[PDB]
């Protein structure tokens, strides 16, 4: 049975009054340094610092030059040469912006997606590898050190509709993506082809060659299934070698490609079987665009619902029914919680809402 308990210590509302779609704590900050998180919504990116007695301190507010931009996602990284933190943001315009979080200057941007970007993810070992997932049906892998487009995951056997989410596994050997076509697709990046494409993106030097960098066009995934959910799949994360994914059926499904005993690294691209291992049930979260999250150690799973409830499960409890923690509710938190983020040490859980409100829950 779960023992995790939390207390709501603070809340605030951003003055733009627009829905907040993204929230991320900076997990790159070193131990002892202040806990910082970013929020995204409207044409805004806002940074906050967490302090004692539930204090949420406003640090900087970025306002995009384009008033019609709607940010949907953000992700933290660091400059591998100077150790400086960096923040990537993207949304409806289909443009990735790399912002210096200390000054709020847009350092650089990446154009190429034919439509909106639904999610950004940085590789867990290499801070220069940025993955973007888009309404154009494709995923794109970028090397932000050399400003190159490494690979485009899409085409013949890629997604047939908007890609809503994606996740790298813990060691960054593979990606699972999902979207509106009801499918979950695996893309290995530790293949000889992709490891060489990544190495080539590092050798690319414009002041040494006049030819443009050639991106890989990966048309075929390493696994594909439409047998987990019967509707859009708007969130996917790895849980070790297993997968967590959700649709609108008020359940997060824990599953794995192949039969029960099949090794993730030995499944063939034509594998037609899937194994469901369990379901984390909840209520009132049957609307699209509702993200679940986990803490760094993958000991807690969190998901907000359409009426302001925040569900939490203890992932160290094998049966998902006994894994359920006490649901986090506040009588004033009544709008849809689009995304949550735990601090690196799991001591703080932040939730962001459709009414521009931010809620801080501290672990007891």
């Amino acid at each position: 049975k779960c023992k995790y308990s939390f207390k709501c210590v603070n809340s605030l509302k951003e003055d733009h009054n627009q829905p907040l779609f993204g929230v991320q704590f900076n997990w790159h900050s070193k131990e002892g340094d202040p806990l910082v998180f970013a929020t995204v919504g409207s044409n805004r990116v806002t940074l906050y610092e967490c302090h004692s007695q539930g204090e949420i301190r406003l640090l900087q507010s970025y306002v995009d030059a384009d008033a019609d931009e709607n940010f949907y996602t953000c992700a933290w990284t660091y400059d591998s040469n100077t150790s400086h933190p960096l923040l990537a943001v993207a949304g409806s315009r289909g443009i990735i912006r790399i912002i210096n979080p200390i000054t709020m200057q847009c350092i650089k941007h990446y154009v190429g997606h034919g439509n909106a970007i639904n999610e950004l993810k940085f590789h867990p070992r290499d801070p220069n590898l940025l993955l973007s997932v888009s309404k154009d049906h494709a995923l794109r892998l970028w090397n932000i050190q050399t400003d190159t487009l490494v690979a485009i995951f899409g085409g013949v056997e890629g997604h047939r509709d908007e890609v809503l989410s994606a996740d790298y596994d813990l060691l960054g050997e593979k990606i699972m993506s999902c979207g509106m076509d009801h499918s979950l697709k695996l893309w290995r990046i530790n293949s000889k082809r992709m490891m060489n494409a990544i190495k080539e993106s590092y050798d690319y030097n414009p002041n040494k060659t006049n030819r443009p960098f050639i991106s890989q066009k990966i048309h075929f995934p390493d696994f594909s299934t439409r047998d987990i959910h019967r509707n859009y799949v708007d969130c996917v994360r790895w849980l070790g070698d297993l997968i967590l994914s959700k649709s609108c059926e008020n359940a997060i499904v824990c599953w794995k490609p192949g039969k029960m005993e099949d090794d993730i690294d030995k499944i063939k691209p034509s594998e037609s079987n899937v194994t469901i291992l369990g379901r984390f049930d909840y209520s009132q979260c049957d609307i699209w665009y509702m993200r679940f999250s986990m803490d760094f150690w993958q000991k807690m799973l969190a998901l907000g619902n359409q009426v302001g409830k925040l569900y939490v499960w203890d992932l160290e409890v094998e049966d998902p029914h006994k894994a359920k923690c006490t649901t986090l509710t506040h009588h004033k938190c009544g709008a849809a919680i689009r995304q949550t983020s735990f601090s690196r040490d799991s001591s703080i859980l932040i939730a962001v809402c459709d009414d521009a409100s931010i809620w801080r829950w501290d672990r007891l």
Partner: peptide
């Protein structure tokens, strides 16, 4: 168990990431 085996993979792989993070000194925001 499938559970204990998967939990052990998560424990060892997050420990690898945690050690890589411990060696780093990223500037605060």
């Amino acid at each position: 168990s499938m559970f204990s085996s998967n939990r052990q993979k998560i424990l060892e792989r997050t420990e690898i990431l945690n050690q890589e993070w411990k060696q780093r000194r990223i500037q605060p925001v």
